[PDB]
Amino acid sequence: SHYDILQAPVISEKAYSAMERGVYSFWVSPKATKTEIKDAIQQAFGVRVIGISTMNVPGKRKRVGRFIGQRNDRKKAIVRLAEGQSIEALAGQ
Amino acid sequence: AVKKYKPYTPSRRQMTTADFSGLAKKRPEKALTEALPKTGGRNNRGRITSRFIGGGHKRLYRIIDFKRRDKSGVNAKVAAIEYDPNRSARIALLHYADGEKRYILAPEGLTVGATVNAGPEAEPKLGNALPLRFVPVGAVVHALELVPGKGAQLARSAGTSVQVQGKESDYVIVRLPSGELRRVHSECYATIGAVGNAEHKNIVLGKAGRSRWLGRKPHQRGSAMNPVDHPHGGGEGRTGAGRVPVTPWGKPTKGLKTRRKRKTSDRFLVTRRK
Amino acid sequence: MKRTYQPNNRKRAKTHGFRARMKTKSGRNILARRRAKGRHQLTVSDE
RNA sequence: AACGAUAAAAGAAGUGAGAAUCUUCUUCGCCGUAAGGACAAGGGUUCCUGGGGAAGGGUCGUCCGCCCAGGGAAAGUCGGGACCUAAGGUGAGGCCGAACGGCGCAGCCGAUGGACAGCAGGUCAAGAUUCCUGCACCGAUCAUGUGGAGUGAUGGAGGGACGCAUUACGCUAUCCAAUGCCAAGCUAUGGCUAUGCUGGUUGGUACGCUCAAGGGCGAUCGGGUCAGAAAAUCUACCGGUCACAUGCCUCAGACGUAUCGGGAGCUUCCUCGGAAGCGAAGUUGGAAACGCGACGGUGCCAAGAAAAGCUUCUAAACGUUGAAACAUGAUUGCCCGUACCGCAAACCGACACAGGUGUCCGAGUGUCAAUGCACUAAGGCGCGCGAGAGAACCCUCGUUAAGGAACUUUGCAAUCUCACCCCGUAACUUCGGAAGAAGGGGUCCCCACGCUUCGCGUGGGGCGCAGUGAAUAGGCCCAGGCGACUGUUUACCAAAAUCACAGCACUCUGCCAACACGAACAGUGGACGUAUAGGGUGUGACGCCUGCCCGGUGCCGGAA
RNA sequence: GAAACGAUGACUGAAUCCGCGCGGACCACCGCGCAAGGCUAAAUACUCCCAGUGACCGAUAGCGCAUAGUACCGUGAGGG
Ligand SMILES: [Mg+2]
Ligand SMILES: [Mg+2]
Ligand SMILES: [Mg+2]
Ligand SMILES: [Mg+2]
Ligand SMILES: [Mg+2]
Ligand SMILES: [Mg+2]
Ligand SMILES: [Mg+2]
Ligand SMILES: [Mg+2]
Ligand SMILES: [Mg+2]
Ligand SMILES: [Mg+2]
Ligand SMILES: [Mg+2]
Ligand SMILES: [Mg+2]
Ligand SMILES: [Mg+2]
Ligand SMILES: [Mg+2]
Ligand SMILES: [Mg+2]
Ligand SMILES: [Mg+2]
Ligand SMILES: [Mg+2]
Ligand SMILES: [Mg+2]
Ligand SMILES: [Mg+2]
Ligand SMILES: [Mg+2]
Ligand SMILES: [Mg+2]
Ligand SMILES: [Mg+2]
Ligand SMILES: [Mg+2]
Ligand SMILES: [Mg+2]
Ligand SMILES: [Mg+2]
Ligand SMILES: [Mg+2]
Ligand SMILES: [Mg+2]
Ligand SMILES: [Mg+2]
Ligand SMILES: [Mg+2]
Ligand SMILES: [Mg+2]
Ligand SMILES: [Mg+2]
Ligand SMILES: [Mg+2]
Ligand SMILES: [Mg+2]
Ligand SMILES: [Mg+2]
Ligand SMILES: [Mg+2]
Ligand SMILES: [Mg+2]
Ligand SMILES: [Mg+2]
Ligand SMILES: [Mg+2]
Ligand SMILES: [Mg+2]
Ligand SMILES: [Mg+2]
Ligand SMILES: [Mg+2]
Ligand SMILES: [Mg+2]
Ligand SMILES: [Mg+2]
Ligand SMILES: [Mg+2]
Ligand SMILES: [Mg+2]
Ligand SMILES: [Mg+2]
Ligand SMILES: [Mg+2]
Ligand SMILES: [Mg+2]
Ligand SMILES: [Mg+2]
């Protein structure tokens, strides 16, 4: 359902700085429509979104011993809200 | 009659070009230009069939009607005489009081601004479209069809004439540009006059190029080829056949008749072409 | 000098592709024959 | 043997277990229509950060395009799709065929093309017409008002809609000049003490009676059924009518004003050197596009896509107290593509390979011009062995007494010639040419004078061996053979006298044409062509011409 | 072949009970047979898979693999 769509938050110098300007960044399910993501974030956080952007991200191909393989392809979503609305569980961070 | 050229490049002496000064400078009708792609002489299985075709200027088709029975009775006027690339003949535009615009082959002499009338009741003057029987004997005519309403299949290239030898059964005895005598149903339409351009036979190509501009790839002498390639191939020099002159496929050329021996049309040919 | 193999994604897919191979009995016959050999690479679209 | 182009290196300093190879500094050298910059195709994390050093690197590595980890890629407006059609591929029905199958109208797929709303800036260690700032735009849905009767399709018409060469007028990008403007500081080594030197010198938006070349232009009435299946204020005919010079319309760009940026640098703090803050000027003169005004002008023959969106008209329809249309406001904004290499060490070449790879951009000085040549800016690089030696011999070059083809199969090779201006120029000819034939002169600096300027002419003067002072840069002729000519060919030993060629001839072919590909009474090429056309064969510009033999053979014709 | 018999592509085409078809040209006789209408398990074949066995192999042998149709080569089929 809703909660299924949001795999994880993005953790990195970039993303923190973004939330410090009130802009948050989530690892999403690769098939997700932007509207689906928008709605999902709203329900999960009771926050009105004014802007989204997304990006499909090919997973790094790495090797373990003789075994060459690919990590899961992902999708990154960046959202910016109105009203300087924040999200607590990820703001203190 | 023809344009000539001073010899300022070697292949510019012999060269000549047609006289266009009598062609009303017009783009063809938007409602009458069709798209004509080329073919290498390749057919829907992709193989060369017609041999030595390719290149040449891009061409649009200009729809013509030959069977004028659509507009029989009513008459039009000559709007212009334009250039058509895919025909030896110049063509001309028709404006009917009816309101429709049409394209018909443009006969020798027929000037812009003239009016012309199709349908059984029409004078023996240049351009009218008459059934054959209504045509006075010995007349000079072209655009003859072989079946009433099927459309003009005879006398179409520049400067060609059909001269009605005269009536007979249901049919009319007809003289073909080849010198052949044929029987044609008198119900078949026709259009009064010689075909036009006519000086077309005299133009000189001049430079290899010209062939290419007319989409004609160079034509290969068998004698140059190899045994593997063609009957006349091989030998240790310039060689003279070494057998009867023969096509790529082996059937004799030079003299061998080819028209199918048993055929329906035969009892409509009164004299062989000669 | 210019060499034989000159990469083209659309070429390769349209030529050695799965849809391509399935479009004909002989290509179907490749597919089956390959499956049988236990190839990881059934077909070019597997790359 | 070799360490993969002879573009080149030197010192200091740092680091480190270890340094000719890594980092920094100072120089030196090499590319600069490129060896710089930006796309596409392809590749696939190679990008950034931090670490590593077995192997990969033709040495060495502390380094790397290698190994490990973590980060990094953001779109209503760019490209693709939710739009369009081309070749082509498909294709219910339908046409053929032992089978699998081959065709095939409409429809459909199909970009390399049509269509289509966003610009200026800023900044991560790594993204940017995507994010942030600043101000626009587009469709869609709704609300409030202007509503106050039409809306107009799956069919019609208009339109989209197209070539090559050349060229007039105006402008921009952009580059040059200067005792224009602005900012900084200095006096070198004999002089300069600024009139020297260095650097910078306007991008978007809005408005404006300012300027403005160029470019686009019929209106309406009526008639004709028969044309557009039908309809029809639409279209096409026919007829009538409307003050030719033009005005009607547009405004590339310019100027102005305002405003948003940017801007040489200045400052401050500081952590193998970055962070923020601040901000001057905006001139005059000149050059100038393949870009824009533009769907311009002229000339030519080989005669130069389609469909949708768009505009217009009815059919049907539901309406006609809510029909289009407008204005403001709100709302909304899908999918995939964006990192990096991308003339190359990241693509194709088994390699970090002297090869190959499509498009755009591609500054200055000098030079008749230039994308040529030399040097150079920005930018990029010194090509991942090094050091000494200074023999034979080998390669690539410089010069060479006297002679000058005596060499040799052959002047093979190498030299001579070399640009621009003026003078001058043969046989021969198809009167175009041969022709840059041949040959001779000139070329630099100063000064005055004249003229149409960047310049040139004239005169006089000056210096050297020499003045296209270096680089780019024809040796010529006489006479044959072959082919007329431009062209074409054996990827990787032959470029020619081969092929093709315009011209010529023979012949076949009357159109379901001959001819050709075919499982085939399918379909297709020929050709949406029609004997001034089409196939096949030979000859090969042009000129003068093209003889004798029909027994054999082959073709056409004959018939007891 | 003296070529019966079945089998169809083309043309043509009879009797139904004293009738019809065969018996290796063809005739008589003597024998065997009821075409042109349909289904039918069982014994037989094979071995991807499963189990047992072996004067079969034990790491160049045995399957190509002590596992992999992988690495690698090729545009591809395919090889490996
Ligand atoms: Mg995206
Ligand atoms: Mg890795
Ligand atoms: Mg010929
Ligand atoms: Mg030969
Ligand atoms: Mg033969
Ligand atoms: Mg021969
Ligand atoms: Mg050595
Ligand atoms: Mg090297
Ligand atoms: Mg060296
Ligand atoms: Mg130390
Ligand atoms: Mg080095
Ligand atoms: Mg230092
Ligand atoms: Mg480059
Ligand atoms: Mg990618
Ligand atoms: Mg090493
Ligand atoms: Mg260390
Ligand atoms: Mg790196
Ligand atoms: Mg935006
Ligand atoms: Mg098909
Ligand atoms: Mg495209
Ligand atoms: Mg656009
Ligand atoms: Mg688009
Ligand atoms: Mg101009
Ligand atoms: Mg300018
Ligand atoms: Mg000065
Ligand atoms: Mg001094
Ligand atoms: Mg369509
Ligand atoms: Mg990029
Ligand atoms: Mg190689
Ligand atoms: Mg190297
Ligand atoms: Mg290379
Ligand atoms: Mg330039
Ligand atoms: Mg230059
Ligand atoms: Mg150069
Ligand atoms: Mg530099
Ligand atoms: Mg580089
Ligand atoms: Mg000498
Ligand atoms: Mg000498
Ligand atoms: Mg001699
Ligand atoms: Mg030589
Ligand atoms: Mg002369
Ligand atoms: Mg000379
Ligand atoms: Mg002297
Ligand atoms: Mg001199
Ligand atoms: Mg030279
Ligand atoms: Mg030649
Ligand atoms: Mg040549
Ligand atoms: Mg060769
Ligand atoms: Mg050669």
Ligand SMILES: [Mg+2]
């Ligand atoms: Mg029988």
Ligand SMILES: [Mg+2]
């Ligand atoms: Mg062992």
